[PDB]
């Protein structure tokens, strides 16, 4: 109940971490694309 706020907001924040690393992969791969274009 309050333990539930612990034990499931932890996996909300896990989902935040997944979304953040996904955004990181999108950014760096798009810039690698542009680098291949200019080369």
């Amino acid at each position: 109940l309050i333990k539930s706020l612990a034990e499931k907001e932890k996996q909300l924040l896990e989902r935040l971490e997944a979304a953040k690393k996904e955004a990181e992969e999108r950014v760096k791969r798009a810039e690698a694309e542009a680098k291949a274009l200019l080369e």
């Binding site: 109940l1 539930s4 706020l5 499931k8 907001e9 996996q11 909300l12 989902r15 935040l16 997944a18 979304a19 996904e22 955004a23 999108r26 950014v27 791969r29 798009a30 810039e31 694309e33 542009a34 274009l37 200019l38």
Partner: protein, 62 residues
């Protein structure tokens, strides 16, 4: 908590929209950088053909 699970569906909605926006912005990047490779390729080609035309005209007139 049920409203914590509703907070989780709001977070998953944000994850869905954030991956959509991530692919949207990366798509715009790869798009505009390719089309600027395009039109720039073409400018290079017409310039170096025009320079060889200058070679043509000027050497033949000389």
């Amino acid at each position: 908590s049920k409203l914590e699970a509703i907070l989780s569906q709001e977070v998953e909605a944000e994850i869905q929209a954030l991956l959509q926006e991530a692919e949207a912005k990366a798509e715009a990047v790869k798009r505009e950088a390719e089309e600027k490779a395009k039109a720039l390729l073409q400018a290079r080609e017409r310039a170096l053909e025009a320079q060889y035309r200058a070679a043509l005209r000027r050497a033949e007139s000389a």
